[PDB]
Amino acid sequence: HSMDTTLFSDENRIDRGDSLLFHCVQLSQGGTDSHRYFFGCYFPRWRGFYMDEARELPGPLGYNVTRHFPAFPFDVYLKDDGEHFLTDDFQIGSIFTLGGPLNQRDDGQKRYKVVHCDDSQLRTRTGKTLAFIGNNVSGLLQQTHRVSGEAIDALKRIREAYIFNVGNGIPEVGIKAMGRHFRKVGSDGRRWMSYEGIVRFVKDSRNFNATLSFSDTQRTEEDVNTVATCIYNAFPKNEEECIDYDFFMDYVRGPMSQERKDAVWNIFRRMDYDRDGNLNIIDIQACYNTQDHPTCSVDHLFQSDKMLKGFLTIWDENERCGLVPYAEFLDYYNGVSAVLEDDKVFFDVLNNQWKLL
Amino acid sequence: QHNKHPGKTVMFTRKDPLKRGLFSSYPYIPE
Amino acid sequence: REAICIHIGQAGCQVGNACWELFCLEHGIQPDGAMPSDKTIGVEDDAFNTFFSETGAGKHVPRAVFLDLEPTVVDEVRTGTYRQLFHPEQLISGKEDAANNYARGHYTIGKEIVDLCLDRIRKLADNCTGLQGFLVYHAVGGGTGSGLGALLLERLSVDYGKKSKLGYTVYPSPQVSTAVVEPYNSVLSTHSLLEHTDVAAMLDNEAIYDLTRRNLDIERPTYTNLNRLIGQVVSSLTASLRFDGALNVDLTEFQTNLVPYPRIHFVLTSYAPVISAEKAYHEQLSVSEISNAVFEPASMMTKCDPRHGKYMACCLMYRGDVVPKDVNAAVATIKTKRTIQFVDWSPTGFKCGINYQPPTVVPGGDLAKVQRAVCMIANSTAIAEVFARIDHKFDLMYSKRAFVHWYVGEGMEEGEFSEAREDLAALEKDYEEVGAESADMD
Amino acid sequence: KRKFLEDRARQRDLLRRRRFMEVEEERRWAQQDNLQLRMANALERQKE
Amino acid sequence: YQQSRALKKEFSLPMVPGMTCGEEMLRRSYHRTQVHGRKYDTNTHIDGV
Amino acid sequence: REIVCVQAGQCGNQIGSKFWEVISDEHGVDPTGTYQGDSDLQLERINVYFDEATGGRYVPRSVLIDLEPGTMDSVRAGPYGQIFRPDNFIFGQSGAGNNWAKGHYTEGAELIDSVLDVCCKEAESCDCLQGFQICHSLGGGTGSGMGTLLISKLREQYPDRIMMTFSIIPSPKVSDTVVEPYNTTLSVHQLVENSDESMCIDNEALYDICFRTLKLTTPTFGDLNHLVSAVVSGVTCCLRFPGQLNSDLRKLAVNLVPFPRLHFFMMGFAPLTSRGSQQYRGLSVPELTQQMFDAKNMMQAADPRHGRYLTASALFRGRMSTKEVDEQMLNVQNKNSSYFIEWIPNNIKSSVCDIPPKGLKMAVTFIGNNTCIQEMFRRVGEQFTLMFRRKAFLHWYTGEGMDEMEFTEAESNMNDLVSEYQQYQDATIE
Amino acid sequence: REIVCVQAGQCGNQIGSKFWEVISDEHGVDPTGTYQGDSDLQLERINVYFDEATGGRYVPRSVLIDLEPGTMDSVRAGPYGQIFRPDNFIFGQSGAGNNWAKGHYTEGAELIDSVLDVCCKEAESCDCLQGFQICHSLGGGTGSGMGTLLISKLREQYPDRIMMTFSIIPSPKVSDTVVEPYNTTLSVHQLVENSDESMCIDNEALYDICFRTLKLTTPTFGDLNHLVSAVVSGVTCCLRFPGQLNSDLRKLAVNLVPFPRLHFFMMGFAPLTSRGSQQYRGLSVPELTQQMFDAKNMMQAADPRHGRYLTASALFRGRMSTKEVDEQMLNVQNKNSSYFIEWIPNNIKSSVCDIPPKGLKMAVTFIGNNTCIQEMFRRVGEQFTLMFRRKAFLHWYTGEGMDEMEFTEAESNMNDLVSEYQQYQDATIE
Amino acid sequence: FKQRDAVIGPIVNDTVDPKNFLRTGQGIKHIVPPVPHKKQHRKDFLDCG
Numbered sequence A: 001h002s003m004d005t006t007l008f009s010d011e012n013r014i015d016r017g018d019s020l021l022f023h024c025v026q027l028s029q030g031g032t033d034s035h036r037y038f039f040g041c042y043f044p045r046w047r048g049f050y051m052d053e054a055r056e057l058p059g060p061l062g063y064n065v066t067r068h069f070p071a072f073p074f075d076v077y078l079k080d081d082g083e084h085f086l087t088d089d090f091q092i093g094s095i096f097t098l099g100g101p102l103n104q105r106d107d108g109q110k111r112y113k114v115v116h117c118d119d120s121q122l123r124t125r126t127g128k129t130l131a132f133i134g135n136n137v138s139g140l141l142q143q144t145h146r147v148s149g150e151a152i153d154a155l156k157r158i159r160e161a162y163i164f165n166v167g168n169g170i171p172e173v174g175i176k177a178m179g180r181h182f183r184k185v186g187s188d189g190r191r192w193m194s195y196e197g198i199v200r201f202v203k204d205s206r207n208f209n210a211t212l213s214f215s216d217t218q219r220t221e222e223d224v225n226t227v228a229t230c231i232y233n234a235f236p237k238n239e240e241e242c243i244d245y246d247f248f249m250d251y252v253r254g255p256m257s258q259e260r261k262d263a264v265w266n267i268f269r270r271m272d273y274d275r276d277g278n279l280n281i282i283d284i285q286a287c288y289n290t291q292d293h294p295t296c297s298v299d300h301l302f303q304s305d306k307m308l309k310g311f312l313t314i315w316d317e318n319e320r321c322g323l324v325p326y327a328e329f330l331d332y333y334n335g336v337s338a339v340l341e342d343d344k345v346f347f348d349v350l351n352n353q354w355k356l357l
Numbered sequence B: 001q002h003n004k005h006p007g008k009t010v011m012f013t014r015k016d017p018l019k020r021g022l023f024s025s026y027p028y029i030p031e
Numbered sequence C: 001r002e003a004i005c006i007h008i009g010q011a012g013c014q015v016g017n018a019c020w021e022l023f024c025l026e027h028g029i030q031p032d033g034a035m036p037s038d039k040t041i042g043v044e045d046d047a048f049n050t051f052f053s054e055t056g057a058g059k060h061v062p063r064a065v066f067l068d069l070e071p072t073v074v075d076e077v078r079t080g081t082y083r084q085l086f087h088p089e090q091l092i093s094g095k096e097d098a099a100n101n102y103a104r105g106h107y108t109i110g111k112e113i114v115d116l117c118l119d120r121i122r123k124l125a126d127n128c129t130g131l132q133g134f135l136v137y138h139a140v141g142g143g144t145g146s147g148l149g150a151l152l153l154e155r156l157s158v159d160y161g162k163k164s165k166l167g168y169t170v171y172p173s174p175q176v177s178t179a180v181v182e183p184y185n186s187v188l189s190t191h192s193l194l195e196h197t198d199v200a201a202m203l204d205n206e207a208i209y210d211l212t213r214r215n216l217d218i219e220r221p222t223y224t225n226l227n228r229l230i231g232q233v234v235s236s237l238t239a240s241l242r243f244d245g246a247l248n249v250d251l252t253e254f255q256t257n258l259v260p261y262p263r264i265h266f267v268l269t270s271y272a273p274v275i276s277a278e279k280a281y282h283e284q285l286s287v288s289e290i291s292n293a294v295f296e297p298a299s300m301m302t303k304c305d306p307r308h309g310k311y312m313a314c315c316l317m318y319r320g321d322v323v324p325k326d327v328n329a330a331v332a333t334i335k336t337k338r339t340i341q342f343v344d345w346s347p348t349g350f351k352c353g354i355n356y357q358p359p360t361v362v363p364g365g366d367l368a369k370v371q372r373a374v375c376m377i378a379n380s381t382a383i384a385e386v387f388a389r390i391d392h393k394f395d396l397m398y399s400k401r402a403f404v405h406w407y408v409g410e411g412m413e414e415g416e417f418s419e420a421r422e423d424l425a426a427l428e429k430d431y432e433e434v435g436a437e438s439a440d441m442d
Numbered sequence D: 001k002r003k004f005l006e007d008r009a010r011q012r013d014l015l016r017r018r019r020f021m022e023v024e025e026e027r028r029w030a031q032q033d034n035l036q037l038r039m040a041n042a043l044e045r046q047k048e
Numbered sequence E: 001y002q003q004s005r006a007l008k009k010e011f012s013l014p015m016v017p018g019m020t021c022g023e024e025m026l027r028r029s030y031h032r033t034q035v036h037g038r039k040y041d042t043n044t045h046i047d048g049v
Numbered sequence F, G: 001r002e003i004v005c006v007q008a009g010q011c012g013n014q015i016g017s018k019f020w021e022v023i024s025d026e027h028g029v030d031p032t033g034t035y036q037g038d039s040d041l042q043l044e045r046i047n048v049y050f051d052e053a054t055g056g057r058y059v060p061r062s063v064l065i066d067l068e069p070g071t072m073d074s075v076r077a078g079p080y081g082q083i084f085r086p087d088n089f090i091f092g093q094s095g096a097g098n099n100w101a102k103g104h105y106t107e108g109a110e111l112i113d114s115v116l117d118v119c120c121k122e123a124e125s126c127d128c129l130q131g132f133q134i135c136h137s138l139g140g141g142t143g144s145g146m147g148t149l150l151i152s153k154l155r156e157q158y159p160d161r162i163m164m165t166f167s168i169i170p171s172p173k174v175s176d177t178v179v180e181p182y183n184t185t186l187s188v189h190q191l192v193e194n195s196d197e198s199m200c201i202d203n204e205a206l207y208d209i210c211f212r213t214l215k216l217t218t219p220t221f222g223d224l225n226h227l228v229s230a231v232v233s234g235v236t237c238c239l240r241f242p243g244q245l246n247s248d249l250r251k252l253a254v255n256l257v258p259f260p261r262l263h264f265f266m267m268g269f270a271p272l273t274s275r276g277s278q279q280y281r282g283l284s285v286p287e288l289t290q291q292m293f294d295a296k297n298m299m300q301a302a303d304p305r306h307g308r309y310l311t312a313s314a315l316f317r318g319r320m321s322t323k324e325v326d327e328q329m330l331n332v333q334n335k336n337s338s339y340f341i342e343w344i345p346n347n348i349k350s351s352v353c354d355i356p357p358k359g360l361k362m363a364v365t366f367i368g369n370n371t372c373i374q375e376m377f378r379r380v381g382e383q384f385t386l387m388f389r390r391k392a393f394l395h396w397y398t399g400e401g402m403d404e405m406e407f408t409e410a411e412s413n414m415n416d417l418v419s420e421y422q423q424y425q426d427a428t429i430e
Numbered sequence H: 001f002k003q004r005d006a007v008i009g010p011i012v013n014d015t016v017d018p019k020n021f022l023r024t025g026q027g028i029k030h031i032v033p034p035v036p037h038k039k040q041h042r043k044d045f046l047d048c049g
């Protein structure tokens, strides 16, 4: 009999019951979707589970109290192949989807990732061997897909063209501008690439061009069309004939661990004082760390304020309204993570970059 | 015959009713 | 060095949001209360201290209380962007409003809440080492602002004694009005403001609407614009405490120079370079032009014309790139004018202050960015006209006891109406007598 | 001072976790009671 | 990328204080059921197990 | 700050059903009771009208009373009927018969204890209780008798709160019930002592609103009750959402009532637009104000042109400038100065709320206190005197047990109310 | 701390069978007597009601007495009947005939020695003995007469223990037996001298509980006896499980009884609510308190509103905070102060136990000492006086041998009980 | 910090009679008894000489 027992603890009840609690987060590129939190419970007796959404609102006495409303009511849900959800599907790092939105807070199908799991009151552990965890058919499709070598060569030369021409030999700014035309986030929670967008993308590399004669312009159009067609057909398409941006940067930028994503999101959460998906340019100006940089402190090759102005330059919407969305931040750090190899170097430069509290 | 409301419209307003958008203005005094 | 801000009711909390937004942005404290340690010039550099105190972990928290009887506005502050800036104890909220009744605020509901407020103010005053006054923001037109503001000023005046109390007050405007019972609450308020304030600044929303329409180019203004102007005025007056300058002015110097007799403490306020960014490229903005601007009645934040009275004292605050010789030349030019007149017993009519820090620019703001500004506070007999029109409206309603049963039901004697109306009549006669030229031997 | 500050941060995180767990348990009990009610209603209909 | 088993939910148009039609008149049988004086449970819906 | 609703009689139960449909729609509550809304602004004041039952559900703070359950069976069979708590339905075994004395004295005293028990259980559950809200007709039987009985008991038990009524009053042209003058006179006598603020609606004015303004081809009682539910849910909107100038039921009462007997008000709701003309007029604060003062848009038969406004109130919903509201109220007061009582310097209160009703850019509800209400009472008193002098139907009431002296008291009190309005209309400064 | 149960007559044996079913379920004892429970908390106090038989089994410390074996043969044939010790069933060969004198004097004195021998064996077997607990009806024949005989003998032999009774008493509207007033009056005369604490239940009140609160379509005596067994097992729950504020039968008596004759109590149990309604109202400590004071939930026909509370006790089961319990009991005492005797500063005792009954989140049992019980005794005395003036049916009792002076003393003693309650109701400080 | 109370409900059957009808001026009025308060006239009167 411990001293920290609650109302529903097993030491305070005679009857028993089985269950499985878990917490979830949403996998989406939208800024506002990153702040949301979910919790739920699973009942193996009926193979049915529910999930709720938690919000923080001021209470009657002044301090904050948490409020919840259903996100998925109790039901016996099934996979895409018809099998039931077992206990093994709610492990840490399991990604699953259930179906279309059942309330007005979402506009399309979304994926959910389990971040916490408690089984202090679970007595029936069910699991199917040699089976996939969760409902993640898109990830399986990505794993089983194979892309052509000439596509990889085309993307390599395209990346080189951005890094030199669009940047100034700085790879981070070059990669950041590479996904400029795919900033919009859809109702699914992921960014899509159209064929016309791809054609506009390849043309911006400033590499497929020559003298302004008619024949040369026609030849450049033919070359850019062939390259865009080659890249477009090497990736799986959805309805309305679009491909995925994340799978694209899996071969442009490369694989990225979960810890890097977590640290980037933690910085974004700390810097955002509202709960929208936008950052203010004044906050970026105040929180950046040009002063202690060795090229301005011990080498005196650059000036601190000039390099701060140059850093404020690279954001696409700094001269008009000064709002930086979530996707632009993630693109910049996609470039940054692509540039560096080692984990500890990445984490050290990431900590030194921003002088947050 | 359909019955009618026994009240006729009297009150009328307009958009931007103030003079030059100002509630009041001070007169000019010479020197 | 330190000053404590007390915000009461709806207008006072909403004006507080704009004030603390400005003071944060001017000093450089982030919304979560943390200076990047670059915004200051080294160690032993303590300028924020007038308005902020730091915790041992280096978080900043502000020297303010927010007082309201309804939850909604304080809950908006609790859920807004500045959630982490304020200490949760500082944000005090009741259950239900004073329903535009001064009697309900003073007798029934504020009487329950006043000791918690005094305990919070005590907790602030204990964390100071050179407190030199209270700044109070409230409106006298509403029930809780009038009733609880009066009760709280009475208690503050007994407990703290000699410490100064400066009020920024929204008085009922001369023809725009929002509620029927405004005259009763404003009359009953003025007795307390008479006894329990050292200088009182009067504001009318109709004047700030006129100023934002005429000078700024805003077709559809709202209260946030007025609140940004008020915040700029408060920042100008308190800048003398916070930044280097040629001629500093401590808050006791205002009272010494501006107040001739202990009852004559109601002052007019105006601000010069209210100008839009598009207007800013058509005009130079020299010292003499803005000095000429502060004396036009189109610049005033109260609907009165000072040409119908005589000035007793003026206090001129210059901030930014100004040189004293130009201030002297400007003041001599003002003195030459024939439509500006001073009472003959006040020959040396002016006090000057000069501070080097130019006014701050707020990201959403409507004022242009300018290198210099001047702010004026002045004591003038013209204020007597405001009381005559409020008293006439009171006399019109009270002749038929138009609403009195509410006030009598919530606990107040009918006699209190006549006493207050006679006190305002005596204040009117004081302003008539002080303004009379010289005297006679018979 | 640094050690003290990080310890305080850990303590605050634990407090928030406990405050969430209480509401989670509440919701689980509510669902269990609902299912019990459903079974009782079904039995009554069958008997009728 | 295919939709899973659960279905889209549809939400009705808002109730403007005007612009409503006589949808109650489209019925063709208006039998009223006695609930309060007879049924102890009333018409409380309880879901299936 | 919680409101408790009471629905009495057929009219009251039907209007209540439409009101709770409108309120459940505005806060995104499913007819199963589950919250399915899309903003935190909806959740943070849901307590004002709903209590929370376990795992999601919300229940509406309303008591339904009637002497025969037929209407209640219709509302329970309706699309939202499930939301109502079964224990909140109180009923007898025989109807009121449109007779005030029966509804007040025989089945009233039989049922009233169960209604008071439910009302006390509902009131004491609130963390802080605001006024009561009652819907009933005055011409009926159970509406008049049980409404005034319950109002008197609640005023005994809760004298410091607010008492608010919405009431249907007999049309000047066609009666729906033969014995309307007796029931109306006795109910107005009860209300003027017990009530704090009372709104009156003529069904004839709603018919003319529908036909002339909305040009509906085949209106039904659902449309009239939707218009009423719209204004009813609008008066309380500032209680439950943020805004630039908050307001409260007590603040309306304090600004509207100059003297305690003068608490009867006219009602209107502005953004009614014709079925085929929305292309011809843009939304603006002047357009709302113009509709707001048009007598076509007022829900009573008396017209402002025969009286004078003592006071008025306008509550605005939407994102708008305060300057336009203030200058519109100044311009209307200055241009029409003869229709405003001159010994009050400003008759109109304004209030502004940020959140409009769904699918409207802006809305306002208007409450007006006008002396032309005296014409309705005079007409009712005339019809009462015509019937009473001849004992036209009096044996029903006297056989139930009423003293004839009650009728003379109610007539004298109403006649004095008419005289008091007439005296304040013609008062002068001198 | 062991309790000994006595079950007497038809009503007592029937209620007892359901009680021992409920207790065996709560401690997880199979009908063979084998422990099959799922927590140590069940086993660690099993001694309180059970004795240990060899290799696992438990036997319940209860004596069953009746004058004709029909009921005993029905319970022995029931599903749990085997658990009972064969030697504990004592029966005669002819019925009580619903006659107090037969049950008390002729077959009572004939059987009572074998019952006393069994009761002594059971008492002397305990390592420490707590009070006796007896269930019987007062309107019957063997229940009233032999129960009160046995009570007198046990009070002679064990005067330092506690004597607690649960008793069924005649409804105000319909009799189950014609000669109920005589048997009731004589039994109440015996109880007020002999008993330490007596609980009273009307079967009519249980019918009203079932119909109004639980809305059962087809209730049976099993449901009424389940409600009673639930409350009975709830009063003892703190004796036999851990808790934050332990309580005991003697401590209950010390806090409930101001003066030794005033030991008659009203009973209630709170989380009663119909299967249709449960979706509409969540369980909470305010909800238990609201049901707890609603006269609808009290198991007697007398209503608290006609009397005043001298004292009350509430026993809470579950892991819960003390702040809500204490402040709820304070708030109820302050708000309803006219119904509480003013010369006692706090009338309610609270107690808290960690372990709720299975399948309920929380439960409370309520015991109340209220002066409105005087009206019931007055009604019984009236009916007794009506019968005695006409010597109604008296020859049966006189032929058995009773002197009429017993009847005149018992009537006088009940009348004095009514007068003493009435005097303390209207007492004042001066 | 006030939490919800508990009410047992009154009995009003016997208080309604046709011979005890409401009269003029018998409405329930909530009037708070007045509490006197002191005032501090610290400011001296105008002394301009």
Ligand SMILES: Nc1nc2c(ncn2[C@@H]2O[C@H](COP(=O)(O)OP(=O)(O)OP(=O)(O)O)[C@@H](O)[C@H]2O)c(=O)[nH]1
Pocket: C008, C009, C010, C011, C012, C014, C015, C069, C070, C097, C098, C099, C100, C101, C139, C141, C142, C143, C144, C145, C146, C170, C172, C178, C205, C223, C226, C227
């Ligand atoms: N300048 C300015 N005036 C305001 C503001 N808010 C309200 N007012 C004015 O102040 C008066 C209303 O006073 P309120 O602050 O609402 O009164 P209150 O303090 O809330 O008092 P209660 O109504 O009893 O709660 C009106 O003349 C409004 O025009 C504001 O934010 N800025």
Ligand SMILES: Nc1nc2c(ncn2[C@@H]2O[C@H](COP(=O)(O)OP(=O)(O)O)[C@@H](O)[C@H]2O)c(=O)[nH]1
Pocket: F008, F009, F010, F011, F012, F014, F015, F096, F098, F137, F139, F140, F141, F142, F143, F144, F168, F170, F176, F203, F221, F224, F225
């Ligand atoms: N607006 C509106 N009026 C109604 C409704 N039902 C009845 N009325 C009117 O109310 C009066 C009849 O009163 P009624 O409700 O039948 O009284 P009751 O018999 O005591 O319930 C008549 O003037 C009807 O026209 C309704 O649903 N809406």
Ligand SMILES: Nc1nc2c(ncn2[C@@H]2O[C@H](COP(=O)(O)OP(=O)(O)O)[C@@H](O)[C@H]2O)c(=O)[nH]1
Pocket: G008, G009, G010, G011, G012, G014, G015, G096, G098, G137, G139, G140, G141, G142, G143, G144, G168, G176, G177, G203, G221, G224, G225
């Ligand atoms: N609540 C309840 N009352 C009962 C039960 N059995 C009998 N009674 C009541 O007890 C009274 C009859 O007493 P009874 O037990 O027959 O007396 P006996 O003949 O001496 O055993 C009547 O009021 C019956 O309604 C029962 O199982 N439950």
Ligand SMILES: [Mg+2]
Pocket: C009, C010, C070, C097, C142, F246
């Ligand atoms: Mg307010």
